[PDB]
Ligand binder design. Structure first.
Ligand SMILES: NCCCC[C@H](NS(=O)(=O)N[C@@H](CC1CCCCC1)C(=O)N[C@]12C[C@H]3C[C@H](C[C@H](C3)C1)C2)C(=O)O
Ligand SMILES: [Zn+2]
Ligand SMILES: [Zn+2]
Ligand SMILES: [Zn+2]
Length: 305
């Protein structure tokens, strides 16, 4: 009982990854890139018309368990790819020329826990030595300025950085995947909520990236594209300057691997519902977000490297 306009539990998303791939075998393939702490398969969808030597864009959702609109968006993206390939000029060009590696739910164990026990859970569900506090923040667990200010050394904290960079199976799986395909991946997109913000590097330190001007301009344009639909207002900028220090993030790690187009999207809303965004807003949120993602994709295509 999957619906793109409702939040779906993991069993349902999992079955959807299988069914959407089987229904669209010339546009989608599915692999498991690793397993979670609790043993769940971490699925990755490769969306695109197969071809030789294609560049790729990587996008993850559901790094954080409670950010349900993020998981909903990755599903929406794949929905749009299969629905509009052959029917809309831009998406057609995109899937011909690029592959999208879409990881619909990174932190599966945490996501299950938000359905069963605690709707507000954020972290993974791994154990910690010397305490009964559970979990590591995957977005403080990447090897980029790892465990500095903005992450916590306290396992009971929401920004706990883990026992070591890539301590979490989920983080290692994602990083291993990108490392194994680094020469093909041209952009990194990470979907989160909330606050209506596009972030680009850096978040692990107060410093601006080599291509700050370009990323500023691209973010500004993507935010403009997004607003055209419903007038939804996003702000944007380097992470540590706009948001806060948040070291060990996947976006900064990917950027330092040489993926120069790297962004974090914080979706709706601005705090009225916060993480508990009503299902009635999934459609509008996803449709407007699609415009910003497509804008960035089209830009990357015009600026291959
Ligand atoms: N990689 C670079 C960007 C990373 C941004 C990313 N943001 S997020 O975790 O997805 N969501 C954000 C949304 C909020 C942002 C400010 C306004 C109110 C909402 C979030 O949960 N942040 C906190 C911020 C602290 C520490 C810990 C628990 C509380 C307090 C909420 C996470 C991330 O901190 O990892
Ligand atoms: Zn998040
Ligand atoms: Zn649509
Ligand atoms: Zn240019």
């Amino acid at each position: 009982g999957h619906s793109y306009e409702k939040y779906n539990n993991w069993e349902t998303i999992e079955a959807w990854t299988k069914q959407v791939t089987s229904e669209n075998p010339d546009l989608i393939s599915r692999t498991a890139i690793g397993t979670t702490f609790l043993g769940n398969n971490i699925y990755l969808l490769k969306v695109g018309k197969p071809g030789p030597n294609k560049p790729a864009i990587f996008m993850d959702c559901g790094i954080h368990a409670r950010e349900w609109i993020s998981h909903a968006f990755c599903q929406w993206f794949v929905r749009e790819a299969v629905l509009t390939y052959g029917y809309e000029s831009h998406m057609t060009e995109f899937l011909n020329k690029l592959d999208f590696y879409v990881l619909p739910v990174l932190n599966i164990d945490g996501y299950i826990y938000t359905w069963t026990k605690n709707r507000m859970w954020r972290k993974t569900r791994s154990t910690n030595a010397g305490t009964t506090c559970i979990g590591t923040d995957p977005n403080r667990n990447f090897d980029a300025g790892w465990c500095t200010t903005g992450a916590s050394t306290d396992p009971c904290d929401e920004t706990y950085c883990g026992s070591a960079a890539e301590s979490e199976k989920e983080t290692k799986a994602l990083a291993d995947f990108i490392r194994n395909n680094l020469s093909s991946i041209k952009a990194y997109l990470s979907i989160h909520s909330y606050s209506q913000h596009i972030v680009y590097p850096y978040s692990y330190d107060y410093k601006l990236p080599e291509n700050n001007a370009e990323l500023n301009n691209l973010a500004k344009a993507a935010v403009k594209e997004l607003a055209t639909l419903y007038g939804t207002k996003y702000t944007y900028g380097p992470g540590a300057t706009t948001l806060y220090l948040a070291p060990g993030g996947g976006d900064d790690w990917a950027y330092d691997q040489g993926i120069k187009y790297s962004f974090t999207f914080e979706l709706r809303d601005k705090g009225r519902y916060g993480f508990i965004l009503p299902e009635s807003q999934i459609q509008a949120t996803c449709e407007e977000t699609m415009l910003a993602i497509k804008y960035v994709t089209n830009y990357v295509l015009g600026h291959l490297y």
